[PDB]
Amino acid sequence: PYPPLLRAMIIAERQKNGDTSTEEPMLNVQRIRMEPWDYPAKQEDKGRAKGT
Amino acid sequence: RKTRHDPLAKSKIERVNMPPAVDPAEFFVLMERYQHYRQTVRALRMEFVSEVQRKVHEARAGVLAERKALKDAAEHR
Amino acid sequence: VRPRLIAELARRVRALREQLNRPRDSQLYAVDYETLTRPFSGRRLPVRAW
Amino acid sequence: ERGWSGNSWGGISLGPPDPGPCGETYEDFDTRILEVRNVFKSIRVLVAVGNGKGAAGFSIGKATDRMDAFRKAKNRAVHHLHYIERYEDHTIFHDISLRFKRTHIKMKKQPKGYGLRCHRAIITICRLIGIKDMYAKVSGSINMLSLTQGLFRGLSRQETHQQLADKKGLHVVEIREECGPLPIVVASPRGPLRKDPEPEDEVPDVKLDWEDVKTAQGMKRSVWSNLKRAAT
Amino acid sequence: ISPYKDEPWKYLESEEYQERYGSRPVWADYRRNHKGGVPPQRTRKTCIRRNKVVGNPCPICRDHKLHVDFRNVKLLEQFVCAHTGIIFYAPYTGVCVKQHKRLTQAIQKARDHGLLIYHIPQVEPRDLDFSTSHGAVSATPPAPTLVSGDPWYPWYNWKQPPERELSRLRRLYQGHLQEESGPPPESMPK
Amino acid sequence: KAYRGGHLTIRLALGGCTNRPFYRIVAAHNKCPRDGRFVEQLGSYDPLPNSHGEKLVALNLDRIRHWIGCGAHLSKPMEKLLGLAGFFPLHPMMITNAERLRRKRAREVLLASQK
Amino acid sequence: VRSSVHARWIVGKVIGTKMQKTAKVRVTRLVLDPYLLKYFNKRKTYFAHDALQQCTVGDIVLLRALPVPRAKHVKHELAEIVFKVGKVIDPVTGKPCAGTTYLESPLSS
Amino acid sequence: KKPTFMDEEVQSILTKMTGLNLQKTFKPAIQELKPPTYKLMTQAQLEEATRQAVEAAKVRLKMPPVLEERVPINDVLAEDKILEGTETTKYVFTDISYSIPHRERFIVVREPSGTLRKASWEERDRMIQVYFPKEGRKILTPIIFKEENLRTMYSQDRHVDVLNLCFAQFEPDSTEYIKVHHKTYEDIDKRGKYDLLRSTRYFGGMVWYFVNNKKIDGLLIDQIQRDLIDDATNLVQLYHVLHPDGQSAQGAKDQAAEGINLIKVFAKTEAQKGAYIELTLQTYQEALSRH
Amino acid sequence: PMKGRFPIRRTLQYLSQGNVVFKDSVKVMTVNYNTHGELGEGARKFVFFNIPQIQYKNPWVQIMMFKNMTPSPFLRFYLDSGEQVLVDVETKSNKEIMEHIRKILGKNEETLREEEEEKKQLSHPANFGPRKYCLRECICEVEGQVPCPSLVPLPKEMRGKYKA
RNA sequence: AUAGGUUUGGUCCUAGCCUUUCUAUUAGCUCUUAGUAAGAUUACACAUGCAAGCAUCCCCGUUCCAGUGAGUUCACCCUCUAAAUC
Ligand code: FES
Ligand SMILES: [K+]
Ligand SMILES: [K+]
Ligand SMILES: [Mg+2]
Ligand SMILES: [Mg+2]
Ligand SMILES: [Mg+2]
Ligand SMILES: [Mg+2]
Ligand SMILES: [Mg+2]
Ligand SMILES: [Zn+2]
């Protein structure tokens, strides 16, 4: 579901533009894959300690 | 604040930051809550990014913008 | 603008000396197991790793 | 009551003028001292009189004694009265710019409640005449006699709205911001009315004062302008 | 001690006031004492200092029967321009700062009580359209969770972790554990 | 001004007086001072209850959505405010702190009963 | 977007032709005096690429910005000659003129 | 259907009944003054200026719409019980996006119980004043609208000032607006002060209220006494169209009453003081004959 | 007094009376006019009275004047596209020339009103900040809210000195 | 500036200087309370203590914030286009 206020605003805009459909607004989350925090990162992009 | 060239204070050269103790049940529930909340917030952020890009595209080459461009070009003619 | 050439000279010399005096992994990631500190920098490892 | 200063004769009232040999009384007239000077000894006094209803005058008096000079000046002033036209009996009909000898005077008509923001002598003379709202600036040599003469001259040579209507044969219509777009006709020609409109001068060739334009544009910065002062 | 303290406006229609001031304002005859031709841009703070009047008290302070009250409308009118409705600044009438502040407050109170006439302009409406059909002011369709009594998201509620995960955490954090917490109270304890 | 790296973030800049805080919700570079230069003011937050017993929060939702869609980050207090407004989900820590406070009040009630 | 030169179109008078394929042009703009509130002419010199060497000192020319500068000071090119010096063609009628008098009468055509 | 207040026919009747007195419409305002300007004008130019002033007055006298009292807002967006007891004061969230009509603007309240609900009309008005302040409006209700201060204002015959303050402070569909306007109209009716509102934008609303509450007797009497017979006949006609199934409309249809006969029809059928209406009308007819 | 004939021309109010705001296409305006001849009189007036106003309203447009180079006065406008617009101005008064150029190359009132409405959005009334940019400095200026401690002391319970 | 004082035996003109107004610092004398704001003269020299960590090791941060006004048209707009966030 959308957050309450954002859902209310989406529905209000829909009714303002004449749409009267009753389907609930929904946030698609299938494309947001939650990667485990301990997944290996990109070592090529990591830095190195400077000599001193 | 100190710069990297400033020396470390002598009163904390023997300081160990001991990690805090964990409550396993609360820890696990909080981890799951952060996962779900971040998924939802990322979905919302993607939606807002799409709105911003769509508004920019409409401003440049939308039907209203192109109509107004043809209109004032004609009027000039 | 009066040229600032010493700055360029120093930048180039520093880059060369950093690329020629690179610390090696055996130096950077060595550890003293008694005190659990890096001898290269003297910084102690986090407790949760000890 | 004191005059313009504690030790100054200027601004002090001398009371009503004495009943004249013609037999007229002047109980409605007030007299004010404008200047007292030692003539090398005699005394020369410049005084002004006025009934507060447009009739006002001024005179010089020379005598060995101060009181004799006052009496002479007052009695001669009452017999040399100007009548000063007042718009709505509180202000002048239009802005008046004049130069008498080396003394320059700019006078500006003002709305009700503006008060007398004028040279102190001008404030005194205006109170004698009956003008209640006006702005005045005196430039050049501040000579008291020249100031008085120029003030009376300019105020006596002001054109009333009726005079302008008769001259131009047209309605004089007043526009007030507090009254909106309502046209108020203040004067109409006594004779016939011209059917051709005044030329709509796209840019009039008027002589502007840099002082007024500078104030209007906000480039005036004087620390002495628009200071709070007692009611006048 | 004034007999007009309870009804100050009485003093303005008493013969004593008429003899003292006539039809002119109570501040008409007052004059400040100062050096130079340009007066200081503020009046004195107060003419009465520790129950002692200064040598030249201001028009309000020089008369103890003049009471600055929001009901004394006629006295307040003397300190407002009749042609612009603007309260005179203190140097105009010579009133001290204390009495000027009191007069300003009394005038504002009189205007707020409808006792002193002031110009009330005619304004345009706030909105162009007066419709109330938008969802911001109308009823929004309830969400399924609101009808069902469930939380908006399932993770708003506490779910007991499996014992295997609790044991995994107990191994991960050996020697640095707190007492395990159970499900929280369903409502806020009173 | 060029900062090394950095990003835009929507955060709370503190104004007001001693013992009277007030907040402006602004989008600013993270490296900038707290009350310094900002890109846009996106709202305000008065944390002191007014005469009606209300904490007033103004949110420019259109501009907040714009700046989130342009890559701006959010500070934790701002995320919590947006969760309270219903614009975002309730932050996990509001839920966790509520549960902790419930448990603490339960312990206090149990102490009272035991006494 | 089409050019990095600030002045896209400018009109000026050719004041020099001593450089090869380059004309030195004087451009006047009207600048307000903040105090007097009167407009005064302010002059600026521009170098314009003139490939064909058709510019003569004193003629009024139009300069178009180059997409990028071709030299340190050459940022413009000669778009056209508005008024050739002493060979002015009246634009309203199209006929040659010498000052305020027609060399060829408009009625002749 | 029954005509609305904004119907063209009703609006024309009320506009002509209001009148247009330029002197009252553009009465000199007590404000900061500037030196007046002067123009030399011919007769034609003066007439053109007067016509432009008439058009400006017509714009100034535009009648505010008459609205029905707004229904209270009672809508819950969410019930987050987990938040219950975690806060002591409510949060008010106002969406301050610039380009939104104020009646389409989302304003919500998070209560200490954890309920996210929509703000009430009073809360909406206070918040909109807080963030979009309107000149003349106050966040806190002025005390002039209390009953005692309203009595004082009425005693000073400052009804138009009261209505201007009401229009500045309250929304047209708000309860306070309606109550104050109705109280002012009742005072005008009780004390016969109708002329106070003539040539103003509130006369139409007052007339509409009187017509819908069936108390046009005093206004009709005042119009007759002021020799505004066309206004009186139009008032009876508006009464008939607003009440077409009443005794007055039926009688006027029956005997084919027109003009003053409509007033006689109303006085005989549906007037609370028809006798005195008849007396005033008969006196007016005698005066007209004598003149 | 102010020097020169028609000193009103050198006042900001007159300079802001100008009603010609060129479209963005116009880059250069050349004004060819003649010093003598009745038929060019209006053009001369156009140079005397209206060029200052046009320049004031269009500071980035290059205006240049030419004298006695052609038998007839005329205006020429160079556009960014490369087009040239010629306007003959014999027998035309200065007011007529102004109206003509306003019609053919001037922004209409609708576009100007749109631009002012866009300018309005930049100054949001709800923002709090310095007087140079915002209506109010702080929320404490809003009635019903807690006022400044500078003007009204806070109760001891809300001050840290009495909480620590 | 609403101006005023002052050149002469005297009048007029010109012209400088000063007075009256509003701030800031310092000095003399004097000084009850509460709230708030602001607070080295010095780019002279500095005793002493603090001002940068975090984190299952890698990294990241310490290039920020805070300070000063010595030097002084690198600050603004347009074109182009890196690094950075998404
Ligand atoms: S300025 Fe807001 S509390 Fe003082
Ligand atoms: K780290
Ligand atoms: K410096
Ligand atoms: Mg003395
Ligand atoms: Mg001098
Ligand atoms: Mg001291
Ligand atoms: Mg600091
Ligand atoms: Mg990049
Ligand atoms: Zn006093």
Author numbering:
A (entry chain 0): 165 to 216
B (entry chain U): 27 to 103
C (entry chain 0): 6 to 55
D (entry chain D): 190 to 229, 239 to 430
E (entry chain O): 48 to 237
F (entry chain M): 10 to 124
G (entry chain N): 4 to 112
H (entry chain R): 66 to 356
Direct quotes from the study:
Mitochondrial ribosomes (mitoribosomes) synthesize proteins encoded within the mitochondrial genome that are assembled into oxidative phosphorylation complexes. Biogenesis of the mitoribosome requires trans-acting assembly factors that chaperone rRNA folding and guide mito r-protein incorporation. Here we used cryo-electron microscopy to determine nine structures of native yeast and human mitoribosomal small subunit assembly intermediates, illuminating the mechanistic basis for how GTPases are used to control early steps of decoding centre formation, how initial rRNA folding and processing events are mediated, and how mitoribosomal proteins have active roles during assembly. Furthermore, this series of intermediates from two species with divergent mitoribosomal architecture uncovers both conserved principles and species-specific adaptations that govern the maturation of mitoribosomal small subunits in eukaryotes.
First, an N-terminal extension of NOA1 blocks access to the h44-binding site at the tail of the mtSSU, which is occupied by h44 in state B. Second, the globular domains of NOA1 hinder h44 docking at the subunit interface while also sequestering h27 away from its mature position. Dissociation of NOA1 allows for docking of h44 and its stabilization through binding of a helical segment of mS38 as well as repositioning of h27 to form the base of the platform. The discovery of ERAL1 within states A and B enables a direct comparison with bacterial systems in which available structural and biochemical data indicate that the binding modes between mitochondrial ERAL1 and bacterial Era are similar. In states A and B, ERAL1 binds to the rRNA 3′ end with a C-terminal KH domain in a flexible manner, with the GTPase domain binding uS7m. In state B, the presence of ERAL1 precludes docking of h23 and the complete installation of mito r-proteins bS21m and uS11m. As a C-terminal tethering peptide of bS21m is already observed in state B, it is likely that this segment of bS21m is responsible for the initial docking and eventual incorporation of the bS21m–S11m–h23 module in state C upon dissociation of ERAL1. In states A–D, the presence of both of these factors prevents compaction of the 3′ major rRNA domain, splaying rRNA elements and protein modules apart to allow for significant intermodule flexibility.
